[PDB]
Ligand binder design. Structure first.
Ligand SMILES: Nc1ncnc2c1ncn2[C@@H]1O[C@H](COP(=O)(O)OP(=O)(O)O)[C@@H](O)[C@H]1O
Ligand SMILES: Nc1ncnc2c1ncn2[C@@H]1O[C@H](COP(=O)(O)OP(=O)(O)O)[C@@H](O)[C@H]1O
Ligand SMILES: Nc1ncnc2c1ncn2[C@@H]1O[C@H](COP(=O)(O)OP(=O)(O)O)[C@@H](O)[C@H]1O
Ligand SMILES: [Mg+2]
Ligand SMILES: [Mg+2]
Ligand SMILES: [Mg+2]
Lengths: 375, 680, 375, 375
């Protein structure tokens, strides 16, 4: 366990679950959240073959396993899965008896109430945690970057949200939420690589496609002369190696796969795109406090790591927003670990001590108290 | 209500008799003073069999009292118990004391063990020929001096120097055997046995049955017990010219002897000890050529430990970079270099009827083959020394009555319970099963003697879950040892996933790999390190042919007569030793020791509790209290009834008592309830 | 019988029946499986002349006997023959009362169900064996070689199969089976030696041809410069002695007789050849787990003992498979006794104890239970 | 040639190539698409023996020919084959000089772009067709059945696709494509008949297996009581005659061979099966237009002719979909000729006249214009 009764901070966030003790500056446990099942008949005896594979063992044997992503779009689908993944993160990675430290979990905004009610119920009644608290993934990014106050434009593999935070207060009348996330870029890439001739259908290929998206994708400055010029010459075409030893060439689809985050008509959703989401989020605040947000709008979340996101977002705001207005985008380079670093501070480095949910209050109140306390 | 014991940190059961407090909130004063708010009632003694309370408080109080009374208080219990006083025994091992032990039957048998030795000699004279006495005691309990005093008492009794030859033989045995364990910098060697054959009382024959050697100490070692004392003595360099004649390097040079940084030890002068061992071998009658061959054999074992194995498909063959250790090993063993290399890397014994195939084994197999050759060679070397030991000992002229004596390593703890320690725990478990069977037989004999109809197996359950089933833990370990690519953690997952419930044993905590098992000496979690690498063993025929037909004459005599699981052969050997011990009349003796100060008038209640737990003295007390512990005669029960408030009158005043023939076989808790009724 | 109630392991495998106790490392009984009948009239009295010759007595008197191979292509043809050969292997070689030990039999993959149903029926109802089990000749080769996981490319005198095994699981959607086996190489050699001038028609010659195939055959590296160069000089031509005392010379047919295993158009079957069978077997697995199989593809079976099989197979994969890909062929030299050595372990050295077919279940279920249990 | 300059409509579709003039109601040319090669040595002079057999002559001589299916899974493998089959369909069947009429070809959705670029290139540059157009096999089924708007669930021997079409518009964000097609049912049947004892390995047997699949297969209502009950009695067992004169009996494999289209775990692919493919295709459309598709989902393609497909699909939707919802499956009985009948209308009976690719535009643009025009 731990050499101190400091609390435990872990984001589950539907992608790569991040976990570690409070008061650190580095997360001590990171793995891709995934639940594996053997799909084929076994004949060889004695190599374990246990029907519950999870995490970093799961990407090792990922050729003969089905894949089950447990958390989708910010909603939790199957509770046996999260019951499994909590137990695996606690007992195998940080080897911690969970009844020694309180915990801090998180969510996106606007998630359904039964989900938070289940999550609050489970750690108390199955793990007997002393205390629990739920934070907001919009908030802690600012405690990560230091208190600059503004728009937190964070998009992970689950969702995308737009929360303005001013001066110590949040604005619940004008937050936003979209579903173009990491998964939809994967699934657009699946239909996109099929144009070249390649073909991927099964879910074991999904984490391979995720790798190519993680490497060879960059957000073009213009979306017309790029898609004309790379169609005019192969200067953009690079290569990659599938784990068999093949060589796959990539055309203009290095940029068209995250292009649709600024043009979400391609995948058939109807919405604004994330830049107009940011702008319409700002226009629903007051005319008094506006000009801070234009200079203190902060990115976060691992889907915003494509090399060109900053200049593209800046040019799009500058064309969109009123003219004589200084616009300034922070893009801190630990952003893929931003949120947990936020959970680094807020658990340990505050007066956050009576603000915990004492389990006594849970035994007196039931689950729904986590509605009326933590936000 | 006020007279009781009190559990505390230092005084684990302090007989605190101050105030009758509440049932669980027990707030009173004590010997240390006023205490706060559940230990049992409290009431130097020779026997606590008639005590009002049969508890660890009264037992520890009698222990500390006899430590203060300087008496080696041996309770009768069909088994005695003494303490190493770390002092001289005047008029206790004396010949007049031996004459009194030969004379006084009932009186002197209380604290004295030579009187118990005379009783055992009379029982052997009472046509109970097959008889032996168990000697419970740890490293530094004085069991060797106790056995010497018992041999002196037997020579005073049986008449008929074997004791001096036994004294001269223990230096040759322990040097080949002992190392620097966590409990002793001069540890034990192995299980040792002795048998004195009597020619109608004339004790004339010498025999030994020392088995269950520490074969795993050849290559796998992780603590200061790595260097065998013979191995360290050869590493000490008992001859400087023969070192260059044997190409013997430094003590750090041998990689097989490079285990856990215990090269220099502040416990032995192994050059002078090696000279003393050579003198003892000459006293046994070893030839100088025989001594040179033994030294050359140990040197060849060291060079073979230094013989590195290496990795076309390179994973089935080896190479040679420091081939000097290979060539010196070939020279010191007097066999061909290419022939020994082929016997290493080839393993080619696959024949059908006239065909023959050469299965060129892998590097991980190759290192195991080297380890197997070494473990064969050293075991053959210990066996030849045992043969010479039994030769220089000399037995009787086909005698039929012998008395046995046994000294084996018992239950123990460490920072981690290794598979060697696990096998030692299994040995102590089988020994405790036999001792508990003897105690239960004595209890049933005492019940049938007083005609008491008095209406353990979980130890047999632990033995079954460990080894005895076809799906046992030793069996599953052997099973996973065979099928390749068996990960150690994967072994642990099945280990905790088969027999998961239903034991005094389960999986570890939030850790990597360990198996917690509550043996009779308490709960130990053996840490699942490379037991799957330790228990591997192999015996091939061509290695036996190369050992038999090599040019070294003594080595040819060490393997002249030329299934694969160390747990399997260990189970067979331990079962054989238990079956051999089953044929004799049992006695038991417990050697305590004041190991705190290693001096007189000192006591370590933690170490004494560990001694009573490991030897099962507390367990024997529990098994005795399980039956009818209180037993007082009808006159004794009448006196107790007169003290409280004639057998029918005592039954009317009283109404688990069971009046037998003349005694009242009752419970000690009933005796304590009667004492509380007498006090109130 | 036996000094222990360990089970009994015997492969019948249509060629040389291998038999022996479990827990050994050497098969104690080996003979060529063959049933002999006298074909000519007897006149001399009293020399036995019993009309059921079998096995090692059968190759002694093989001049005046018909030959009847009982098992063909993995299928059993006549059940009186296997009833004979089981009884001869039990009572004469290992002298064992069969009702004392369970037995382990085997098959190729994809053998017809009535065959396994007959074999399961016969030992129970005619020999009263306590227990029975059927294994797969694809599986036990890995327990022979130690658990390397890969393609088991095994070809005996019966069949050739290609089974991938990964990590404790088998892949039944992509196994293969061909019929180019030992017998077809004999029968190609019969038509091939007739080109030189020699002539063999009767079935007593068949085991003589089998001997020359067992000795003087080797797989050429190239199949063109070899067949041109040995046609240019007699450096390859060797000699052999028929049991009369004749001397027969062999031309380029030392290599052309197993050449057709990489070119099976010669004998008029239409298939791929065994190397393309291996490659097409691998390509029908996932792209995730591929690169293990290229380095852990394991040969077996006595038809793969021709001196040159390893380098030829390696060069053919390396030309065929994608390029930058380490390919590695294990070829353990006890391979002709591989399968039985596999049966050495799996019977005795496992938890294989409730997995036996208790004969009680056979009396309650009938034969078809051996369908639903053993695979 | 033709008595009118109406265009020419032919689907190639990897199976049976259908061809005929526009404006008809019946296809005038139908043959199994196959390319034949002689594999054995000829000695008899003068019987043609030409090494390019194709089509209906090819199933006549199909004992001594190799078979080469030219188009696989919707992709075209060898372009000499399609160059052959186009020339044979034009010059021998409809005897038409191809430079007199425009042509209409088709595809599945999501086929690789180089394929359509090759097909567009070849008719223009080798046959000098006046005009060309590529349609979608999802579309024309509705013009076949009359404009009911819905899910087109069509599966031929190439592929299976799921396209929703609403009200005059298609939904490219949620089409589907699977590969369980006619060929995989053949290859499951090949491994299935081998369980009974029969054995088929060579490619000349493939068209024989195709016949038995075309006749004696029907989709069971339940998949458990059928596979228990036919295992309890031989009421389902029928017989068939191989062209030698043998009689082969069929067990429960009349229904298990197309059972796997609703359980595609058997052949080791990982997917949903076609009914859950249909349901997941519908759930990725809007909540506004849903209830039309439940009542206007239309089958097509010759793999959906097994007697029981309609009730099985209906029961599976009704258990799967939300309850109080009228579900209605059209199953028009000319469905095996549906697509070409669709090509009957759309070429001739529209304003489809400037929508053709004038070959002038091809000479000015190159092949890639067939990307930007026809869809
Ligand atoms: N090049 C890249 N570097 C880092 N992350 C990337 C990259 N490309 C895509 N990603 C996405 O970033 C995500 C990182 O996890 P994320 O979803 O940000 O966690 P959270 O949900 O807690 O925000 C992954 O889902 C991955 O899909
Ligand atoms: N040189 C050779 N050495 C060994 N076996 C050979 C040789 N040449 C051919 N063989 C073939 O190997 C076969 C060995 O038996 P095999 O069929 O492998 O048993 P199984 O059917 O169990 O695999 C024999 O049929 C024999 O035809
Ligand atoms: N009983 C049957 N009747 C008609 N067609 C069948 C039957 N059984 C199977 N089929 C399949 O229907 C297919 C008809 O051709 P198809 O592939 O539908 O053309 P397209 O590819 O243009 O849709 C053939 O491949 C054949 O395998
Ligand atoms: Mg995440
Ligand atoms: Mg065989
Ligand atoms: Mg078609």
């Amino acid at each position: 366990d731990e050499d101190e009764t400091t609390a435990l901070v872990c984001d589950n966030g539907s992608g790569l679950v991040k976990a570690g003790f409070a008061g650190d500056d580095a997360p001590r446990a990171v793995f891709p959240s995934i639940v594996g099942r053997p799909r084929h008949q076994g004949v060889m005896v004695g190599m374990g073959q246990k029907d519950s594979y999870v995490g970093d063992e799961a990407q090792s044997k990922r050729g003969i396993l089905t894949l089950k992503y447990p958390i989708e779009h910010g909603i939790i689908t199957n509770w046996d899965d999260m019951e499994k993944i909590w137990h695996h993160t606690f007992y195998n990675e940080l080897r911690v008896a969970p009844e020694e430290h309180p915990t801090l979990l998180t969510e996106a905004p606007l998630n359904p109430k039964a989900n938070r009610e289940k999550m609050t119920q489970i750690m108390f009644e199955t793990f007997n945690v002393p205390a629990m608290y739920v934070a907001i993934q919009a908030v802690l990014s600012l405690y990560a970057s230091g208190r600059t106050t503004g728009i937190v434009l964070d998009s992970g593999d689950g969702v995308t949200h737009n929360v303005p935070i001013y001066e110590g207060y949040a604005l619940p009348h004008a937050i936003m939420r979209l579903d173009l996330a990491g998964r939809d870029l994967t699934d657009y890439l699946m239909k996109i690589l099929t144009e070249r001739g390649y073909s991927f259908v099964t879910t074991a290929e999904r984490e391979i496609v995720r790798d190519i998206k993680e490497k060879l994708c960059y957000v073009a400055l213009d979306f017309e002369n790029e898609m004309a010029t790379a169609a005019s010459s192969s200067s953009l075409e690079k290569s990659y190696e599938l784990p068999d030893g093949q060589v796959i060439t990539i055309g203009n689809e290095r940029f068209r796969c995250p292009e649709t985050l600024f043009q979400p008509s391609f995948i058939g959703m109807e919405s604004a795109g994330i830049h107009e989401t940011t702008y319409n989020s700002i226009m629903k605040c007051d005319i008094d406090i506006r000009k801070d947000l234009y200079a203190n709008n902060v990115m976060s979340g691992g889907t915003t790591m494509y090399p060109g996101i900053a200049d593209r977002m800046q040019k799009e705001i500058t064309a969109l927003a009123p003219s004589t207005m200084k616009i300034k985008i922070i893009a801190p380079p630990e952003r893929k670990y931003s949120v947990w670093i936020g959970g680094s501070i807020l658990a340990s480095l505050s007066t956050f001590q009576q603000m915990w949910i004492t389990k006594q209050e849970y035994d007196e109140a039931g689950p729904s108290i986590v509605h009326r306390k933590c936000f | 209500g006020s007279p009781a014991w009190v559990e505390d940190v230092e005084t684990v059961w302090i007989e605190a008799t101050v105030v009758k407090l509440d049932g669980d909130a027990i707030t009173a004063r004590t010997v240390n003073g006023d205490l706060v708010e559940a230990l049992p009632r409290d009431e130097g003694v020779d026997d606590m069999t008639k005590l009002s309370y049969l508890h660890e408080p009264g037992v520890l109080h009698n222990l500390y009292t006899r430590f203060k009374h300087d008496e080696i208080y041996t309770f009768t219990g069909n088994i005695l118990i003494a303490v190493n006083p770390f002092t001289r025994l005047p008029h206790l091992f004396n010949t007049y004391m031996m004459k009194q032990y030969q004379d006084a039957q009932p009186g002197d048998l209380n604290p004295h063990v030579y009187s118990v030795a005379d009783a055992a000699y009379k029982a052997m004279m009472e046509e109970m020929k097959s008889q032996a006495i168990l000697v419970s005691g740890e490293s530094g309990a004085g069991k060797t001096e106790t056995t010497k005093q018992i041999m002196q008492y037997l020579a005073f009794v049986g008449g008929r120097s074997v004791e001096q030859q036994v004294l001269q033989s223990n230096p040759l045995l322990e040097a080949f055997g002992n190392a620097k364990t966590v409990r002793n910098n001069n540890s034990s060697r192995f299980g040792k046995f002795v048998e004195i054959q009597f020619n109608n009382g004339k004790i004339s024959g010498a025999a030994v049955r020392t088995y269950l050697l520490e074969r795993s100490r050849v290559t796998q070692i992780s603590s200061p017990e790595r260097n065998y004392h013979c191995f360290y003595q050869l590493v000490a360099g008992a001859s400087p010219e023969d070192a260059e004649r044997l190409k013997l390097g430094p003590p750090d040079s041998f990689h097989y002897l490079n285990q856990s940084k215990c090269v220099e030890v502040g416990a032995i002068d192994d050059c002078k000890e090696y000279q003393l061992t050579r003198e003892a071998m000459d006293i046994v009658g070893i030839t100088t050529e025989e001594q040179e061959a033994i030294f050359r054999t140990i040197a060849a074992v060291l060079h073979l430990g230094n013989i590195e194995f290496d990795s076309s498909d390179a994973s089935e063959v080896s190479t040679e970079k420091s081939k000097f250790h290979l060539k010196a090993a070939a020279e010191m063993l007097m066999c061909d270099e290419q022939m020994l290399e082929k016997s290493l890397t080839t393993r080619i014994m696959k024949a059908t009827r006239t065909e023959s195939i050469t299965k060129i084994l892998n590097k991980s197999q190759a290192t195991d083959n080297r380890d197997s050759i070494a473990k064969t060679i050293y075991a053959k070397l210990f066996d030849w020394l045992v043969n010479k030991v039994n030769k220089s000992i000399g037995q009787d002229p086909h005698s039929t009555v012998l008395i046995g004596v046994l000294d084996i390593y018992g239950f123990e703890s460490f920072e981690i319970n290794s598979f060697e320690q696990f096998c030692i725990n299994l040995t102590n478990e089988k020994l405790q099963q036999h001792f508990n069977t003897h105690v239960f037989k004595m209890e049933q004999a005492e019940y049938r003697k007083e005609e008491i109809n008095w209406d353990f197996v979980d130890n047999i359950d632990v033995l079954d879950l460990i080894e005895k089933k076809p799906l046992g833990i030793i069996a599953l370990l052997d099973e996973a040892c065979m099928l390749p690519r068996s990960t150690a953690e994967s072994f642990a997952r099945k280990l905790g996933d088969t027999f998961n419930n239903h034991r005094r044993f389960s999986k570890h905590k939030f850790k990597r790999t360990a198996f917690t098992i509550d043996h009779y000496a308490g709960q130990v979690e053996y840490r699942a390190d490379l037991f799957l690498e330790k228990n591997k063993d192999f015996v091939v025929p061509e290695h036996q042919q190369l050992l038999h037909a090599s040019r070294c004459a003594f080595v040819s005599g060490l393997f002249p007569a030329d299934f694969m699981s160390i747990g399997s052969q260990f189970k067979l050997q331990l079962a054989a030793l238990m079956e051999t011990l089953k044929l004799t009349a049992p006695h038991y003796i417990r050697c305590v020791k004041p190991n705190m100060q290693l001096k007189p008038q000192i006591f370590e209640n933690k170490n004494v509790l560990q001694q009573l737990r490991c030897s099962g003295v507390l367990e024997a007390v529990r098994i005795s209290c399980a039956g009818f512990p209180t037993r007082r005669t009808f006159e004794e029960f009448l006196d107790r009834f007169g003290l409280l408030h004639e057998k029918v009158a005592c039954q009317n005043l009283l109404e688990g008592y069971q009046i037998g023939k003349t005694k009242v076989f009752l419970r000690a808790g009933q005796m304590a309830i009667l004492d509380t009724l007498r006090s109130n």
